[PDB]
Amino acid sequence: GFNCYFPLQSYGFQPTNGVGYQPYRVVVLSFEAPATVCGPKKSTN
Amino acid sequence: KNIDGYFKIYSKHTPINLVRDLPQGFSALEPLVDLPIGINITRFQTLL
Amino acid sequence: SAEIDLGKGDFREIRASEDAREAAEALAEAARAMKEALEIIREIAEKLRDSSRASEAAKRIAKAIRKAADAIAEAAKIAARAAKDGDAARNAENAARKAKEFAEEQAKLADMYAELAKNGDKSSVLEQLKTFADKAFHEMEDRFYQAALAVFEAAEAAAG
């Protein structure tokens, strides 16, 4: 320690932790040659 | 061939009754898939 | 049912045997001491601006950590005698050790970082201050909360 630190840091996840401290799940989808990923075009009768 | 990043591929299978001569035949080759892979292709080597 | 902004915002005025109430004023030597510690170190987390202030601010912080160190133990104690229960009292005496010592270990260390902020060589020592204070501020609230519900857990054990 003492002018020396690990480049790490532990989240302390306990059943009681603050709602802003509790673990959260995050999805970040990137948009961005042929373009192949396409939304579903709905058909019709 | 690779055009517009689509590497198309065309094939055709016909029997062979000849020994070592590219047969005097006639057949149209037909699409198999259209691979949308953006790769420069200048060299190619077969695998057996 | 009392307006105290703890972690996740849970607010209470402990409803149990009066020693748990006494574990609410004596614990208010901690419950009021935690939520003040996470506010003045919150003032030092990035409103740290002056090496000259860094000298005594860390000292008052160190004395507040030192205040917090022997406050969190003082909160975790009196319930365990009025605790009809044993299982829920284990954490507090641990926190009376763990939370006190973890606060204690930085309480002296903040002083040895307050002395290094005393002379105040702002070329590098501020970067010392900024790195442990948040580390402590992360550590103190982590250590706070672990006790902050384990201290009431003993008070919960000290309900009847």
Ligand SMILES: *[C@@H]1O[C@H](CO)[C@@H](O)[C@H](O)[C@H]1NC(C)=O
């Ligand atoms: C072909 O190589 C060039 C090199 O300048 C590169 O910029 C390009 O992305 C490549 N194209 C493909 C389809 O791999």
